[PDB]
From a paper:
Ryanodine receptor type 2 (RyR2), an intracellular Ca2+ release channel located on the sarcoplasmic reticulum (SR) of cardiomyocytes, is essential for cardiac muscle excitation-contraction coupling. Structurally, RyR2 is a 2.3 MDa homotetramer consisting of two functional regions: a massive cytoplasmic region, also known as the cytoplasmic shell, which comprises several regulatory domains (NTDs, NSol, SPRYs, RYs, JSol, and BSol domains) and the stabilizing subunit calstabin-2, and an activation core and pore region, which comprises the Ca2+ binding site and the transmembrane domains. Dysregulation of Ca2+ handling, characterized by aberrant SR Ca2+ leak, is a pivotal pathophysiological mechanism in a spectrum of cardiac disorders, including heart failure (HF), atrial fibrillation, catecholaminergic polymorphic ventricular tachycardia (CPVT), and other arrhythmogenic disorders. Here, we solved the cryogenic electron microscopy structures of ryanodine receptor 2 variants linked either to heart failure or inherited sudden cardiac death.
Since RyR2-R420W presents abnormal systolic Ca2+ transients, we decided to analyze the effects of systolic concentrations of Ca2+ on the structure of RyR2-R420W. We solved the cryo-EM structure of the RyR2-R420W channels under conditions that resemble the Ca2+-induced Ca2+ release (CICR) that occurs during systole. At the beginning of the systole, when CICR is the highest, the local Ca2+ concentration in the dyadic cleft reaches 10–100 μM or higher. Here, we used 40 µM because this is the concentration at which ryanodine binding and lipid bilayer experiments result in maximum open probability, preventing RyR2 from reaching the closed or inactivated states. Under these conditions, RyR2-R420W + Ca2+ reached both primed (27% of the particles) and open (73% of the particles) states, suggesting increased open probability and Ca2+ sensitivity. This contrasts with what was observed for WT RyR2, where ATP and Ca2+ were unable to open the channel (100% of the particles in the primed state). The pore remained unaltered compared to the WT RyR2 states, confirming that the pore exists in two discreet conformations independent of the conformation of cytoplasmic shell or ligands bound. The cytoplasmic shell of the open RyR2-R420W + Ca2+ moves further downward-outward, compared to the primed state, reaching a conformation similar to that of the open WT RyR2. Surprisingly, the BSol2 domain was not resolved in either the primed or open states, suggesting that the increased dynamics of the cytoplasmic shell induced by both the CPVT mutation and Ca2+ destabilizes the metastable BSol2 domain. The Bsol2 domain has been proposed to be the main contact point of RyRs self-association, and therefore to play a role in coupled-gating, and signal amplification.
Author numbering:
A (entry chain C): 4480 to 4524, 4555 to 4871
B (entry chain B): 4100 to 4209, 4237 to 4310
C (entry chain B): 4872 to 4967
D (entry chain D): 4727 to 4871
E (entry chain A): 4872 to 4919
């Protein structure tokens, strides 16, 4: 009855689990095909239309076919991951929670830190009947019961672990049970454990790799609405290759120091902006026509934007951009201003910011 | 102190071991206050010294200003100090810290919801997927099973995983909205 | 140089004990041996509390070891601090 | 073969000046330093090409009116109407520029996309000029060392 | 290289004796032992 559909379902499960990696190669080849095809767009005409330009005419349908194929392959890659790696993650999580519950009593003696999402979410699984579903040790509940049943209360431990004390000893003694057939829909939907499945879904959602694959699939789906969304899949090679992954990790290896250094740079450029706003303001005209002046430092938001945008990027500094100070009563002060800006921002701070990431890579 | 000294000096006596188990609890109570160091004795041998540590001493040793001074002294003694003068610097720091903890008594005498929001999003959003199975409203799916075929089998198999991915997308969106609300 | 000096400082503290100066491996031959040595046998807080206790205690009530250490402290002689040796090393043999 | 071709064109004899670069020891070391970490160098160059391509995608979709490169108002020379041209402009005039692509493209002051374009230019300067190019250079310098 | 060579030169002089070449720690087992060895026992001025 079911034995002829459940077998085929498990066959599909095993097929996707076996071909998970090959479909991850195919999904990467298809995106590198799609983007190469996309590289031949032009704007032709107000309303503008993005038309694929080619001497031939045989890449336009190919792009749509490739988009559908990429979508299907990404969905199949999600299915393959859920078939293959999810049980291992569940096994590791179930082992860790059981070890913490037994050896340390993390939910009996002590309590989670209330800031550990993992520990707080694992509170749900202990009450579930379907515990070590994947872990070998099927009696961690009884072990905890024996270890902490008298000092912390037999009824309290039983309520915490969601167990019935009489059943274990009655099964050790003689018993008369009655199995039931899975044919009944009522039977199967009663057998399904809602709480354990919710905990499992939480674990899967909190897994990082599944989140990466979900982001991949969302990008692939949005690619249908806009074909240029397929360009984000070229970042996948940067994680597929080892040294590119190292380069990407080098950015966040010293993230705290990098963010603090960027904040210090923003403070320094802001102090220079304060000084320029108070004293050197007539030097910030950025228009060649004498009819209309475009002053970049009349409003300090504009001045700070000018210093952070056209100042840090300039090799010489802010003096490369602002007006020459020759012949002015503030010549020496402005010259010190420009020299110190060049030294502190360009020479010192930017070099430190770059060196942090380069040294992290090394 | 006598039991600890005898235990450490008689390492292999079951007769004293039994007294140790009989006196475990007292040793546990006196553990925080039992100070233990090692010195270079007059007999040209290493000796262990047991002494009393007051509770107030610890309450002032875990003062914040004491920790800051401890960090500063460690840094200076390990970089800008020699191995000969290391002990002199340490004892001077000990005197300074004793004065500091004597002053501390005089002066003294008189995120989580980010985790909670993510957990709530998990519970609610998994419940959204779970309501179907909990309501047992799969009667139309059962009717489809009564007309089972390979196409229906494969489509249902794919649709379950698609629904799971839909639930994950909803969870991610809910977490983003919660984080935005929290930061603002 | 400043950053790797700070790193060297840290690594030195997790690698060798402050007072005796013996490496962590010799204590780590047994599990948790270096932590045991740094928390129970050789502890900065323990030495500071011993100095405070010896100051607070009456002179006539000093034991032999306390009087010895007090005399050394008053003469500013730091020979009583264990240098390159410990209880485990001094009784390494007939203990173990 | 180079010597033979030198008869047909005398300037082909200039390739024989590379022979001193292998005759001398340190010059040979410099030449070997280029291919000592060839795999890492090629992968880093590919990553740079991907990053500049993503920036090209963003510029093509949003910041397109800023890419006029003609001073005469009669004829505009838009460098990002076709994405091949845009990618060539970003890889050629963008990586070589010290400040970045913003040194070359039009100033964004007064526009509704001022802050977005400013973030675009700052991130381009940081990721391409400051980070990736420095890594590419450092690979070869460290190989020499 | 020039700067850290100079630093190495200095550190070598404060770390080992010039004539015998024995490390400072062996003499420093006792207080002021290396200074005593370098000023009284093994001294360049004394040899000259
Ligand atoms: N004699 C010693 N006494 C204490 N700690 C020592 C000693 N020798 C080495 N250490 C090392 O010093 C460290 C103990 O530092 P401490 O207990 O003050 O806090 P911490 O390591 O800075 O961190 P936290 O305050 O979070 O526990 C350990 O790494 C220990 O190995
Ligand atoms: N055999 C040695 N004789 C003398 N000095 C030695 C010897 N071996 C090592 N040294 C080291 O050389 C240094 C002695 O140098 P010296 O007395 O000439 O002056 P200095 O250290 O340059 O400084 P200053 O002239 O200010 O005292 C010390 O650091 C000492 O440890
Ligand atoms: Ca007495
Ligand atoms: Zn020690
Ligand atoms: Zn000598």
């Amino acid at each position: 009855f079911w034995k002829k559909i459940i077998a085929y379902q498990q066959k599909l499960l095993n097929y996707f689990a076996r071909n998970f990696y090959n479909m991850r190669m195919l999904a990467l080849f298809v995106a590198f095909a799609i983007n190469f095809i996309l590289l031949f767009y032009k704007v032709s005409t107000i309303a503008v239309h993005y038309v694929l330009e080619e001497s031939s005419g045989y890449m336009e349908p190919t792009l749509r076919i490739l988009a559908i194929l990429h979508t299907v392959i990404s969905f199949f890659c999600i299915i393959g991951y859920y078939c293959l790696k999810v049980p291992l993650v569940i096994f590791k999580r179930e082992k860790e929670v059981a070890r913490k519950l037994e050896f340390d009593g993390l939910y009996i003696t002590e309590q989670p830190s209330e800031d550990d999402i993992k520990g707080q979410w694992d509170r749900l699984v202990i009450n579930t009947q379907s515990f070590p579903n994947n872990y070998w040790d099927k009696f961690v509940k009884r072990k905890v019961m024996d270890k902490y049943g008298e000092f912390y209360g037999r009824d309290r431990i039983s309520e915490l672990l969601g167990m019935d004390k009489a059943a274990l000893d009655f099964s050790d003694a003689r018993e008369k049970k009655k199995p039931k057939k899975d044919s009944s829909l009522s039977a199967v939907l009663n057998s399904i454990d809602v709480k354990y499945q919710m905990w499992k879904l939480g674990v899967v959602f909190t897994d990082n790799s599944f989140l990466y694959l979900a982001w991949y699939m969302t990008m692939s789906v949005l690619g249908h609405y806009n074909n240029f969304f397929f360009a984000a899949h070229l970042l996948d090679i940067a994680m597929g290759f080892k040294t590119l992954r190292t380069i990407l990790s080098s950015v966040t290896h010293n993230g705290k120091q990098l963010v603090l250094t960027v904040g210090l740079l923003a403070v320094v450029v802001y102090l220079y902006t304060v000084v320029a706003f108070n004293f050197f303001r007539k030097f910030y005209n950025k228009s060649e026509d004498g009819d209309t002046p475009d002053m970049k430092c009349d409003d300090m938001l504009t001045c700070y934007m000018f210093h952070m945008y056209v100042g840090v990027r300039a090799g010489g500094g802010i003096g490369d951009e602002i007006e020459d100070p020759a012949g002015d009563e503030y010549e020496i002060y402005r010259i010190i201003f420009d020299i110190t800006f060049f030294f502190f921002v360009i020479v010192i701070l930017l070099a430190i910011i770059q060196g942090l990431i380069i040294d992290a890579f090394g | 102190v006598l039991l600890t000294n005898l235990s450490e000096h008689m390492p292999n006596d079951t007769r004293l071991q039994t007294f140790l188990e009989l006196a475990e609890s007292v040793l546990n109570y006196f553990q925080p206050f039992l100070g233990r160091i090692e010195i270079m004795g007059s007999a040209k041998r290493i000796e262990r010294v047991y002494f009393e540590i007051s509770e107030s001493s610890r309450t002032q040793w875990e003062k914040p200003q004491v920790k800051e001074s401890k960090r500063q002294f460690i840094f200076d003694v390990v970089n800008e100090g020699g191995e000969k003068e290391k002990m002199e610097l340490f004892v001077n720091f000990c005197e300074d810290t004793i004065f500091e903890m004597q002053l501390a008594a005089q002066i003294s005498e008189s995120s989580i919801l980010t985790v909670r929001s993510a957990l709530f999003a998990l519970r609610y959003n998994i419940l959204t997927l779970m309501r179907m199975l909990s309501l047992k409203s799969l009667k139309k799916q059962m009717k489809k099973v009564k007309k089972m075929t390979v196409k229906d089998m494969v489509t249902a198999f794919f649709s379950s995983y698609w629904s799971i991915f839909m639930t994950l997308l909803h969870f991610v969106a809910s977490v983003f909205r919660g984080f935005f609300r929290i930061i603002c | 140089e400043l950053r790797d000096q700070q790193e060297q400082v840290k690594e030195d503290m997790e690698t060798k004990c402050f007072i005796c100066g013996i490496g962590n491996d010799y204590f780590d031959t047994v599990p948790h041996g270096f932590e045991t040595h740094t928390l129970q046998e050789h502890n900065l807080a323990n030495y500071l509390f011993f100095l405070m206790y010896l100051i607070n205690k009456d002179e006539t009530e000093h034991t032999g070891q306390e009087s010895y250490v007090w005399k050394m402290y008053q003469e500013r002689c730091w020979e009583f601090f264990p240098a390159g040796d410990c209880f485990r090393k001094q009784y390494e043999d007939q203990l173990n």
